[PDB]
Design a protein around this ligand. Structure first.
Ligand SMILES: Cc1cn([C@H]2C[C@H](O)[C@@H](COP(=O)(O)C(F)(F)P(=O)(O)OP(=O)(O)O)O2)c(=O)[nH]c1=O
Ligand SMILES: [Cl-]
Ligand SMILES: [Cl-]
Ligand SMILES: [Mg+2]
Ligand SMILES: [Mg+2]
Ligand code: NA
Ligand code: NA
Length: 326
DNA sequence: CCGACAGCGCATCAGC
DNA sequence: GCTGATGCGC
DNA sequence: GTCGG
């Protein structure tokens, strides 16, 4: 927040480029510039001081000078006036609705929260749940509740099979005081990169969490990734907790460190680490870190026994989770 | 100037 | 039904 | 939109 007014602007621009313009790279340009400025330990005094940072070019430098002088951006003031942009930007806030679907609905006069409700018949299952819990999903989750959710999950998983290991990652693992949602990494000995000595591994867990009314709805579900909704139980007379989004990822147990690195984030951090790895002749995904052959082809998985080992390969000092929030 | 920009799971569609 | 592309999400 | 080469 030291430079909150500039990062907000940039984030607003990034949102415009992704949702409205469908220009994914401009989106990431802004997001990176926002990220790099957010960690600058000084109160930026000009766009030139900002251009010194990597990711901030001429254009963003001008926009920053404009913002520093007036306290706003003409481009955004205008963008805020345009009804289509206002609408499309808003519809994308429903989980399941992206830039494409947003622009489509608008082409049908469906541009408000109310228009969606009366037109629920035109939503796929995901967008339906998104709309249903639109309010709740915008709320943040206090670490204290996160801690309660962790308990329920770890204990319920334990009851399905003592060999399951559930790790809450995301901003939670990064030490955040509040989280947008709960991200859960799941491993079991019966599922490695070598074999799936047992099916329904993920299913049985979703099943158990649904049975104890923790999981309330499903957005999507596969053999390795679950995307849904959950809710903490409330006390007698106690007002209900907001519903919460929950992601669960089953990863081969011999690939845990690459998997936990991935899920811990942040998303920008992973982008930067993965890009940096490429520059060092490596490629990293949630499963492994392979070498890039002379021809670019990804080699075989490199032995990994800790998060740090991965960091070593790309010659990066180990950074704790709490320092990966970019 | 110019190509790269991280990597992948799930739902859904088109074409077969 | 499949594969492969696309949209949307992590 | 920004970057390395
Ligand atoms: C969105 C996304 C996510 N990730 C990885 C890192 C996140 O920590 C992790 C969790 O995905 P996420 O979508 O839950 C998150 F990024 F928002 P998170 O960092 O948890 O913050 P919060 O939800 O706002 O509390 O998944 C990527 O690698 N790329 C992406 O584009
Ligand atoms: Cl690993
Ligand atoms: Cl792999
Ligand atoms: Mg999260
Ligand atoms: Mg998540
Ligand atoms: Na720069
Ligand atoms: Na959306």
């Amino acid at each position: 927040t030291l430079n909150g007014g500039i990062t907000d602007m940039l984030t607003e621009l990034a949102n415009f480029e992704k949702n409205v313009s469908q220009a994914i790279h401009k989106y990431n340009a802004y997001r990176k510039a926002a990220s790099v400025i957010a960690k600058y330990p000084h109160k930026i005094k000009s766009g030139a001081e900002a251009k010194k940072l990597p990711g901030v070019g001429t254009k963003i430098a001008e926009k920053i000078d404009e913002f520093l002088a007036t306290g706003k951006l003409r481009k955004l003031e205008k963008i805020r006036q345009d009804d289509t942009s206002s609408s499309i930007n808003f519809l994308t806030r429903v989980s399941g609705i992206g830039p494409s679907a947003a622009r489509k609905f608008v082409d049908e006069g469906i541009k408000t929260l109310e228009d969606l409700r009366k037109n629920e018949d035109k939503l796929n299952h995901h967008q339906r749940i998104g709309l249903k819990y639109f309010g709740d999903f915008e709320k943040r989750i206090p670490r204290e509740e996160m801690l309660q959710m962790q308990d329920i999950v770890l204990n319920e998983v334990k009851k399905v099979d003592s060999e399951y290991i559930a790790t809450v990652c995301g901003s939670f693992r990064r030490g955040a005081e509040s989280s947008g949602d709960m991200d859960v990494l799941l491993t079991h000995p019966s599922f490695t990169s070598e074999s799936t000595k047992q099916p329904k591994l993920l299913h049985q867990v979703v099943e158990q969490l649904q049975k104890v009314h923790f999981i309330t709805d499903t957005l999507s579900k596969g053999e390795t990734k679950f995307m849904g909704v959950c809710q903490l139980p409330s006390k007698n007379d106690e007002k209900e907790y907001p519903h919460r989004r929950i992601d669960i990822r089953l990863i081969p147990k011999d690939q845990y460190y690459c998997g936990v690195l991935y899920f811990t984030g942040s998303d920008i951090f992973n982008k930067n680490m993965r890009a940096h790895a490429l520059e060092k002749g490596f490629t990293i995904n949630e499963y492994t870190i392979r070498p890039l052959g002379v021809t670019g082809v990804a080699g075989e998985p490199l032995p990994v026994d800790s998060e740090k080992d991965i960091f070593d390969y790309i010659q990066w000092k180990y950074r704790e989770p709490k320092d990966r929030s970019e």
